């Protein structure tokens, strides 16, 4: 078995690993050489005697082919080979990406992982070990599993890091950490036709707004709240909250809470230190009666603590020394919570201690009696730090104990944090990175209630750590370069920032994909994947009703534009108007024609998830003076921090089979704004619409077309006598 060169990999910009056929004899710099002006500085055989780390005097140029030459290499224990020649490049040519499919979950949801090669295909036989920083919040598959089997499961609302250590079939290990956020699936409150409010001024404008919003039928003991209640009449939503003038109210559980009518307003008062269901009976002038029930809750009171981690993995030291957050120490947050799990100032009644029985762990930022005082009881939060001791490689745990009364000998509860200290060398060679970037950017982030999603990533802001060959952390570093791989129609990199291009992606993006970003830090480049989405409900597809349309104009009227024909003529006689905001909020239930004067609209539009977007007469907040239905959202776009470019459509269409009767007229080639003109009764125009594109107004008729195939529609327009 005679020394041959099997692999040559640029492990960083000044270091190259050369792997051989067999075990070899002890070697130094004199044994190796490198072309293109570089000189070899050092050469160190591993303990596996199977490879040699060779460091070069000066960084490799990206994408330059170099040739290593090995002279005088001895085998196992005998013979010396002739000159060996090995080429290599320093670039991330055949990188493998590791991606968490979905990093914002609701409770109950799950997410898989995706591992792909340079050609974008799944890596067969790839394995992964996941681990969660906080298993109260996120839980993961145990042990080592196939990548396609791996699962991250959402358990409780909040936050967790999930380390993914992936083993490729050829034995390479890639390690990265993901940021996972779990949000609550909000509890469905029994709908009682009211909601509890500070004052009537900040209440929903009408019955439709009320049914759309979150309802509050709870209050704390010691409060009073005003009742905002909403009726419909003949199925039609009312236009203002119910008025309690001349009504009388009876309190059915007056020990718990009481009610009083003061002019138009009904005010419920919850009594101190009471709780449970309290009901009321209202009697109106008209001899109708109704009841309703409010949940009174105990006042909030300190109940328990919460810690922001369940396990921590630390390196025994940091390269360069010191105590470095993320490498050889970890800061842990502790929060004080009430009986409903909300933050509450810590008292001075109780105490919390932080302790370990594990030699080699050090607790800092803690009082000498092991307590943490929560800014002497004024704060709902506090913190401590755990630190590894150099070269003491022990795994143990930290206990965080809450005592109801400071003087109690037994704790009321105990939270446990497991801690694993791994050994790293003070002079370890860095060979990879852990870049803790968020998994996903969403162009709609600024409009989502969640404050956790982002519409960009600044890579100068993300924790990045260098790793040794074992996958353990060495040092905190910052990026030297960031660059997009390939091109993409929706996103780009500018400096160190991944972001949306700005060409109206909010209104126009209806797909989702993943982009790759090469990030260089400390002479190492890593390819990291990022998904982009758009959770806005914007038009993605449209459909045209096919059946012939006949419009009979009133003897009073002459004209119908194409925009009116296609999208409809609004008829306010069929709609409900909120006078307070001068907008329509509904189609009456008695409506003879879905809210439209002539024919019903021809176009039905959907969003990316397949849901119908309300259009025309169904747009909540449609202005009082709207004349046609070419609209898919509120003109003023109430509620949005970031607006759509345009809430209307444009259409590409042609006109065929024109037949005019009497004085009827119409253009040979109209736009949306041109009109069918009929002067006398008996005048008519007949024709066929060929609709070719439908798209958001101002966008592109080809690229943003919502219509899969063109469609033809026969139309007749006559005038009544």
């Amino acid at each position, epitope marked *: 078995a005679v020394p041959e060169i099997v692999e040559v990999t640029a492990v960083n910009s000044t270091t190259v690993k050369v792997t051989f056929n067999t075990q070899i004899a002890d070697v130094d710099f004199t044994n190796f050489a490198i072309d293109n002006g570089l000189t070899v500085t050092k050469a160190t055989l591993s303990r596996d005697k199977k490879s040699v780390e060779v460091v070069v005097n000066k960084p490799f140029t990206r994408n330059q082919e170099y040739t290593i030459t090995a002279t005088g290499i001895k085998n196992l224990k005998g013979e010396t080979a002739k000159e060996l020649t090995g080429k290599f490049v320093w670039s991330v040519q055949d990188a493998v990406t590791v991606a968490l499919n979905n990093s914002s979950l609701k409770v109950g949801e799950e997410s898989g992982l995706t591992v792909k090669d340079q050609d974008g295909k799944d890596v067969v036989g790839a394995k992964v070990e996941l681990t969660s920083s906080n298993t109260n919040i996120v839980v993961v598959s145990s042990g080592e599993v196939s990548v396609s089997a791996a699962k991250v499961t959402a358990v409780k609302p909040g936050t967790a890091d999930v380390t993914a250590k992936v083993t490729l079939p050829d034995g390479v290990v890639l390690t990265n950490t993901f940021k996972v956020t779990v949000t609550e699936v909000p509890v*469905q409150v*029994q709908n009682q*036709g009211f909601t509890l409010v500070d004052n009537l001024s900040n209440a929903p404008q009408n019955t439709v707004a009320f049914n759309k919003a979150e309802k509050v039928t709870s209050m704390f003991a010691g409060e009073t709240k005003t009742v905002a209640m*909403y009726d419909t009449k003949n199925g*039609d939503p009312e236009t203002k909250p119910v008025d309690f003038k001349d009504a009388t109210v009876r309190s059915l559980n007056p020990i718990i809470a009481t009610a009083a009518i003061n002019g138009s307003e009904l005010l419920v008062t919850a009594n101190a230190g009471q709780s449970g*269901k309290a009901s009321f009976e209202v009697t109106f002038k008209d*001899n109708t*009666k*109704r009841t309703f*029930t409010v949940d009174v809750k105990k006042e909030p009171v300190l109940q328990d603590i919460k810690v922001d981690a369940t396990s921590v993995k630390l390196s025994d030291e940091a390269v360069g020394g010191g105590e470095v957050e993320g490498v050889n120490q970890k800061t842990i947050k502790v929060s004080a919570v009430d009986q409903y799990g909300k933050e509450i100032k810590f008292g001075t009644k109780g105490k919390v201690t932080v302790t370990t029985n594990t030699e080699g762990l050090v607790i800092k930022n803690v009082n000498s009696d092991n307590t943490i005082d929560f800014d002497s009881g004024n704060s709902a939060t506090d913190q401590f730090v755990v630190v590894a001791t150099k070269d003491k490689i022990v795994n143990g745990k930290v206990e965080v104990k809450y005592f109801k009364n400071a003087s109690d000998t037994t704790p009321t509860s105990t939270k446990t944090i497991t801690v694993n200290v791994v050994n790293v060398k003070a002079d370890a060679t860095p060979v990879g990175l852990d870049i803790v970037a968020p998994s996903e950017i969403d162009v709609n982030a600024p409009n989502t209630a969640s404050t956790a999603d982002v519409d960009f990533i600044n890579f100068e802001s993300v924790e990045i750590y260098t790793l040794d060959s074992n996958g353990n952390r060495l040092k905190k570093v910052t990026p030297t370069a960031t660059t997009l791989v390939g091109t993409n129609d929706y996103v780009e990199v500018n400096g160190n920032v991944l972001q949306f291009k700005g060409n109206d992606e909010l209104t126009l993006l209806t797909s989702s994909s993943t982009v790759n970003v090469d990030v260089t830090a400390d002479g190492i480049t890593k390819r990291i994947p990022v998904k982009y989405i758009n959770s806005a409900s914007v038009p993605a597809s449209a459909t045209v009703a096919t059946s012939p349309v006949t419009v009979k104009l009133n003897s009073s009227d002459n004209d119908l534009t194409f925009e009116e024909l296609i999208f409809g003529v609004i008829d306010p006689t069929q709609l409900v108007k909120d006078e307070d905001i001068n907008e329509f909020i509904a189609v009456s239930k008695a409506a003879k024609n879905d809210g439209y004067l002539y024919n019903k609209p021809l176009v039905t539009v959907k969003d990316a998830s397949g849901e119908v977007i309300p259009t025309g007469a169904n747009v909540y907040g449609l202005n009082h003076d709207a004349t046609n239905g070419n609209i898919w959202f509120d003109e003023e776009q109430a509620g949005l921090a970031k607006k759509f470019s345009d809430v209307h459509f444009d259409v590409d269409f042609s006109l065929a089979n024109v037949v005019k009767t009497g004085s009827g007229t119409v253009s040979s080639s109209p736009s949306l704004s041109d009109a069918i003109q009929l002067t006398n009764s008996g005048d008519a125009v007949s024709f066929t619409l060929v609709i070719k594109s439908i798209y958001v107004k101002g966008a592109d008729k080809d690229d943003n077309n919502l219509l899969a195939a063109p469609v033809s529609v026969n139309v007749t327009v006559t005038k009544g006598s």
Partner: nanobody
Amino acid sequence: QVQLQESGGGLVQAGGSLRLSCAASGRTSSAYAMGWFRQAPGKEREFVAGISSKGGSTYYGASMKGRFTISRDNAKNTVYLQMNGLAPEDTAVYYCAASDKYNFDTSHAGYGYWGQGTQVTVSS
């Protein structure tokens, strides 16, 4: 989609007391506000009383509360109309109705699902 089945109709003498029941079948049928209507002979259909999905709220037609009381058993997903102190003008087909929404609506148009009715007849 929901289905409603009434029970407990029949003959009763003036001054007496009867209970009607209506059981709701479906998938998220638990989530349905329900109500009672009636059509007496010679008269137009009229609203009697209504209840929220979990019985926290009820409402009544003018002058109907007393003579009538609505309640609900959530476990059985059934709703009950209790009639006390009946008189000949309560002779009627009593219908159960259900709705997607709860907003104190006392008209037919506030309700999208109907049972088929039961007859209640009141002697002298």
